[PDB]
Amino acid sequence: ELSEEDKQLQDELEMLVERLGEKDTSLYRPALEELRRQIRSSTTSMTSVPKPLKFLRPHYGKLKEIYENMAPGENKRFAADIISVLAMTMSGERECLKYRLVGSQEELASWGHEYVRHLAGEVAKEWQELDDAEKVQREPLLTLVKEIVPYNMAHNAEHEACDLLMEIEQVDMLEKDIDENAYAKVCLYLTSCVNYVPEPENSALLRCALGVFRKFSRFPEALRLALMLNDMELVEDIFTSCKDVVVQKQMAFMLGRHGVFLELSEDVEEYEDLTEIMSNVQLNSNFLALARELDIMEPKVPDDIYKTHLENNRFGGSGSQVDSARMNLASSFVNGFVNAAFGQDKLLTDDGNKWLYKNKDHGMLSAAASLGMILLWDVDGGLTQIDKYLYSSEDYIKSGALLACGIVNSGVRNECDPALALLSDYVLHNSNTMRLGSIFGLGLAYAGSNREDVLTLLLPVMGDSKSSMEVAGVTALACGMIAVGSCNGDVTSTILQTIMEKSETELKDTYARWLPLGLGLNHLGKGEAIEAILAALEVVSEPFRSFANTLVDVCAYAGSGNVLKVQQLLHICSEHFADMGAHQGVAVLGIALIAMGEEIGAEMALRTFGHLLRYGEPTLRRAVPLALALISVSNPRLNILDTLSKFSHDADPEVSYNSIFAMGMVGSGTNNARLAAMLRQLAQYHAKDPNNLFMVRLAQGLTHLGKGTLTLCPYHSDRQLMSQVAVAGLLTVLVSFLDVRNIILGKSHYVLYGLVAAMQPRMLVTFDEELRPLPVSVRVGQAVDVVGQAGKPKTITGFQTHTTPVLLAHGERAELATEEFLPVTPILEGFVILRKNPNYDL
Amino acid sequence: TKGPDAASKLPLVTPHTQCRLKLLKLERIKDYLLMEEEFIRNQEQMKPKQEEERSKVDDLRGTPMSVGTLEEIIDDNHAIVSTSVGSEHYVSILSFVDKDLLEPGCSVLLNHKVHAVIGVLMDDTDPLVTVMKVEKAPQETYADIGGLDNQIQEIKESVELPLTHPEYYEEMGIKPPKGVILYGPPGTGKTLLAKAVANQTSATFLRVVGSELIQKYLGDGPKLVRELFRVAEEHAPSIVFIDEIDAIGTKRYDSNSGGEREIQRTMLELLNQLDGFDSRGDVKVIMATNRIETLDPALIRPGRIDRKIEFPLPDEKTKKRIFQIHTSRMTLADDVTLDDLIMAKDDLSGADIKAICTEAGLMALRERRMKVTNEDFKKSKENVLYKKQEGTPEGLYL
Amino acid sequence: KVSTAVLSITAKAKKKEKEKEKKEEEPNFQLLDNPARVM
């Protein structure tokens, strides 16, 4: 019950509210003045219970009607203020809003923080309740926001300000209202909220954050959000606005990492240095330094990688003297991938022709591509060795050499463009293998280029009726992955015409799946323009109509997180009815690629995939491991590996094959000794089937990629920056792997080399302002945010001290433990430039 | 093989602030859960073979199915099986049974009427052991532990790093530590660290009290310990946490005490499981005890327990970290200076800091305040801290 | 089958789809013969 002070205050409140019965002149001003005074005193204090509000439980009906009849001036406004404060505690949402709306304006700050928050919530509720039928109510709510937002800004309440500004769908005022000490908080809030908000508000929020960062001149972050938006005009605007040459070099490094090559005018000083950095010619050299820091110059051999000295030699000296072709292809992939990018191998460099001569047709192409893939990012160094094998006796393997070129020029660009020159006279080659090699090399060398000359040169291949189905598919995929995430009308129209003119009998083959691929590869991350795409694709008949629609639906929403598209895809998967299950497989890959945008969505996609596996039909069971591989590329999560190990022994050969490839992709480059042991056990168990052995050895090569210093992650910048080229590469490999026997185990091993398009390295090489390497002590650990929305860089814990260059595993980041240097980019990934601290004093 | 049964956990939703970002992440979780529900509801609804297989096998075996103990395998289809009443019967082994699974002492499903071997029971796990397995991972994570960097690093190198990165251990040649005892004054973070590692680990986790592994009947104690460790072996990557090992880890000594000798037999079986004849495999053991000096040397010796992680009373930096973590969900005022609580030598532990925060919240609620102040914390310090009586000598020492 | 709510954005999506749709736009007797059956 009450107290003496409480009872006296209750009596005073009751007297003040009861005096309003009649219309005496000295009632409305005195009583409302007293109520205003008490309410303001209680509300403008600590969060203590508002004692006047607790005591006040009257009815305002008489108060509302008298409001209607008495004092059209300020007294009704005082009454409105009082009833608004009273109804903030009660449930009078619309009335409580309109009391502040039409009553005494004064200011929302004069009431209290809680009153401001409640008014903000009610304003958001009304705005969501108000449609475009009338804009009369919108303007006063906007005026309320005009004062609500600065209140939150000045009282560290940026949460409510940002939320309200997202409800009203208007975010322009953040440009003119954000302070120096609060830009990071709101910017991080937006860059985290963009992933979960659906279309089209995510793009508006992204451009709002872009404008904020431009206003505060945080140019690297502006570049990050510009690549998030995937629009070149604002990237060019940021490039022009960058007046600091060190920031220019940093943004060139990040552009090269993302693979975005924008033409630079000669008006910008130091054009040559920026161009050569963006071409990423230096990377290999740094990689070499990397390797000579870890004493891993010496390349490995497949015999030691398989560890034959440990396998139980049940048949000794009688069952291993025969060298089958398929195991030779697997050993080529191993003695490639494992030793790749180190500039040397002990079996393909000194005994090349002898090795290649024990391969047949497809083995020739695979080994020729692996010869270039054993030396990465050295265009001249790679081609100096590739030319002789291009001059080979078996001119059919010439195409393979082109792959080598295309696999050597990957991740780099030259002014003279050796790849374009070398393949310009070979693209029009009538031989199917020659044209295939030419187009594949051109695509791999020019991933993400979007250069009009190469696209125009690739156009006539689609209209060539002579060109075979697999030539058409490889051409379509190369065109798509040269024009990743651009919605190029030229390529879209060309592929649409090619598929429209294609016959059903010729469409029934597996390679026709690669026709939507490039089309889909033209529309990565842009789901707005795909209504016309689906309308155009609706002309073709089912089932391939549904197949193409599903594939373009995946490609449109790559990482979008649109749960409605995932619901449609899950409905497709759950429909229990050969080619009919292709739709379900593509939809499963769609759930994977949409959910990999967000960590939460991905981890729930894990549970959905488990449910699909334990309760799905054979086609879904085959499809899921590819999805699991897509979800966690180069992220050896133990639960995923355990599920894949459980299903590697399944009685369905396709399911086991897909599970093995999922081991290879998920644990790629992590050098996981547990994964290596499990793969050795799988090789021992599957020692009889050539296909299982081939794919398990491929998985071992993938997991020993670069001796553990290479990753296939399509994500960068704390996994927030997507990579269109890498996403394209994994998409091609996975959709080809939807049919392992006909494509992977058939005539199309070269498709595996598309993963090298996604081949991106991990280091911590630190450069000075002049780009010389600089050893800096670095604190490396997990980025587990021990705070909420404090704006912290996840507050790296699990500390370990390192000297650069350093190797960072997936999910573990780094920070500068020394204040002597300041990084231009606060995200310590890849090559960075540290400016000497001017604030530090000796 | 029977790979690990890792506990399931929902993704962490951060920030923990009551903002729209938390709403969006939680609603994404709800979306995906509803997707799973819709798929799992429409799966069996659209299900239109093996039914003949079931109608034959189940009819042949019939219900109920008795559970007996295999004793001898006479022929390829005849076996001497002892029923639970201890009576042996020469019964037949039906065709639909894997002859390689039958081993002496195995649990075998028999027909109710003719007791013929109709199948083999695989698990036959003691209910007191299957309850030790953790199904719901605890919510406490490594981000909820203030300070304790050395202790967390040691426990990660022991039970976490070998699972994720066995490459270092295999390359250098070390066998990773397979036994850790978390010892120190109470309320320092031993059980909290066990909760955190259980949350983080991808391997199966078994939680023991060090006293539930003790049974009434004469031989069921060591047998229960053996069953628990065998279950840990089954799910190969395993972590066996035995809180309050003091209950059984006490030092061996000679007395009549007919129950104490069984106590010592149980602890002897435990140390045999830890390191005795035959290898232990890839199962780690985490032990916690307030008093370590009272433990038997043969239990905490290296090889059985490789690491002894000390949990001291938190220092100034650690105490400040505890206060920052445990008031993160609070709404602190501007007049609060936590430093005064962190300084002085009250010898307050992490649990003491948690109680201080809780009592400060209660003090604020007493004044009808949802935001705490410095005075509330000061009152809570004296209100809660009154634990020890004297603990100190007089003014002898200058 | 059944369609789940997914109330996170399904209401907004359906209302915006509705806006898009708006943008898009006795005897009383019987004659009988000789063998007539009558109740």
Ligand SMILES: Nc1ncnc2c1ncn2[C@@H]1O[C@H](COP(=O)(O)OP(=O)(O)OP(=O)(O)O)[C@@H](O)[C@H]1O
């Ligand atoms: N270093 C710490 N960081 C954060 N919280 C801590 C810390 N130490 C203790 N706590 C808090 O104290 C609570 C109780 O401590 P805990 O359960 O870890 O006790 P203990 O050290 O195992 O003691 P006992 O000897 O009773 O087993 C934990 O739930 C946690 O919230």
Ligand SMILES: [Mg+2]
């Ligand atoms: Mg405890």
